[PDB]
């Protein structure tokens, strides 16, 4: 089984903060390559483009202010883009455009920057517990085993992160051990505690 290579392709690209992202272009021979252009559109910014004309041996960058976002090496050898260390500002669209004799081909990446939340769990008052997921990105989801009578804060910071707190009470004395269940893309997490 092998279907034809589609012209436009789009993908969600979740990436952790402070890591080295690398976006690949589709596989292409130099013979088939005329131009190759990374268009990088971050939220509320001018469009940065990085072109490489093979015939004329020209590399041309336009409106590219962030110097972490670069070629992996050189577009005459390697058409991969990298992000030096990922930051929350790098949320945006990244598109490899490839001019060939056959046509034009696009592989796009909807890049999402993940931030691992600081997760805690503590006994608060008489038969209550509080589970925090502090300054993660995106918002984490919190649930309890067993279920109680809980309430949830969402706190949306300007740097893009979100704190999700969940206070929860158990009046019923059928409960002693309580388990917080924090659900996040960076990684799911669980925390048991005796409710002394």
């Amino acid at each position, epitope marked *: 089984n*092998y279907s*034809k*290579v589609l012209a436009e392709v789009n993908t969600s690209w979740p990436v952790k903060m402070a890591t080295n992202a690398v976006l*690949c272009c589709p596989p292409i*021979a*130099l013979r088939n390559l005329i131009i190759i252009t990374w268009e990088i559109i971050l939220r509320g910014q001018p469009s940065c483009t990085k072109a490489y004309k093979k015939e004329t041996n020209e590399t041309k960058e336009t409106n590219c202010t962030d110097e972490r976002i670069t070629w992996v090496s050189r577009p005459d050898q390697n058409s*991969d883009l990298q992000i030096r260390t990922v930051a929350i500002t790098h949320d945006g669209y990244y598109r490899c455009i490839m001019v060939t*004799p056959d046509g034009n081909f696009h592989r796009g990446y909807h890049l999402q920057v993940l931030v691992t939340p600081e997760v805690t769990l503590f006994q608060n008052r008489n038969r209550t517990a509080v589970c925090k997921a502090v300054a993660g990105k995106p918002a984490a989801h919190i649930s309890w085993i067993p279920e109680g009578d809980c309430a949830t804060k969402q706190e949306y910071w300007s740097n893009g992160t979100v704190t999700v707190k969940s206070t929860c009470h158990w009046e019923v004395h059928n409960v002693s051990t309580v388990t917080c269940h924090v659900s996040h893309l960076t990684g799911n997490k669980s925390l048991y505690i005796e409710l002394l």
Partner: antibody
Amino acid sequence: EVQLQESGPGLVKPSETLSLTCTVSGFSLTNYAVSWVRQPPGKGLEWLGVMWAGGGTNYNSVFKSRLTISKDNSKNQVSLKLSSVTAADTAVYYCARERPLTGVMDYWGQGTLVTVSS
Amino acid sequence: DIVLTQSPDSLAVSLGERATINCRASESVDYSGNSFMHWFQQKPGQPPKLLIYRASNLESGIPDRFSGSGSRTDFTLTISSLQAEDVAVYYCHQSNEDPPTFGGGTKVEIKR
């Protein structure tokens, strides 16, 4: 299924033009490029030229003076025309579909022997 | 014009034994860390059959005894256990630079 088929005279007199026509089914010529390779008796493979999907062409430099490749998308046909032929041009002529970007030649025609002789 | 050079030009091997065919290129055939060397099988009367595309990738409907390896300028086709039908000529093929070029050919024969 993807198929290719070469038509041709089989015998050609020296210093005349060799005309062949690859006829294709299973795919459109608007999407896929097509190449011509030849194979002289008991010798290796030699690329002649490509008819890119877009309509442009490249030719092997040693054949570039004599060789012409054209196509007709509505007929699903690719022509080859090699002028000023000699005994050296005696060979089996294959047409073969290139897949885009990589230039891998996945499907081939059965071939057609062309003998240059008076 | 990249010059592909297969080695050996023919080998004889007993039935069931391994069979390795090398192909070295005069220049690199790589771009973006992808090697554009491809392997063909041709039997008398028939056109070339694609075994292996971009260096290591196995084609649909080809036995898994056929395998491919290498990068840059040095590549290898390996038949893990040679069968009676595998007697053929084998060709390497670069597609990275214009013009595409083919290897000289390697004839494989069974000893019995």
